[PDB]
Amino acid sequence: RICYNHQSTTRATTKSCEENSCYKKYWRDHRGTIIERGCGCPKVKPGVGIHCCQSDKCNY
Numbered sequence: 784r785i786c787y788n789h790q791s792t793t794r795a796t797t798k799s800c801e802e803n804s805c806y807k808k809y810w811r812d813h814r815g816t817i818i819e820r821g822c823g824c825p826k827v828k829p830g831v832g833i834h835c836c837q838s839d840k841c842n843y
Contacts, residue, residue: 785839790819797840798822805842806835 786805789796792815800822808819810831820842824835836842 784822786822787820787840787843788822791815791817804835804837805839806833807842808833 784800784802784805785797786800787795788798802823804824805822806820806824808821808827808831810817827833
């Protein structure tokens with residue numbers, strides 16, 4: 784699988800992973816949202832939002 788692995792406000796990077804799934808984590812606190820991404824589809828803890836998706840470079 785090929786997937787995005789840049790967080791918020793960082794140069795667009797991709798990695799490869801073995802997983803079939805890939806994800807975007809997202810949360811916000813101050814005057815901007817912290818988005819982070821990776822491969823697979825793990826469960827996260829409340830307040831910290833998520834979405835996972837099942838196709839290469841979906842997780843922008």
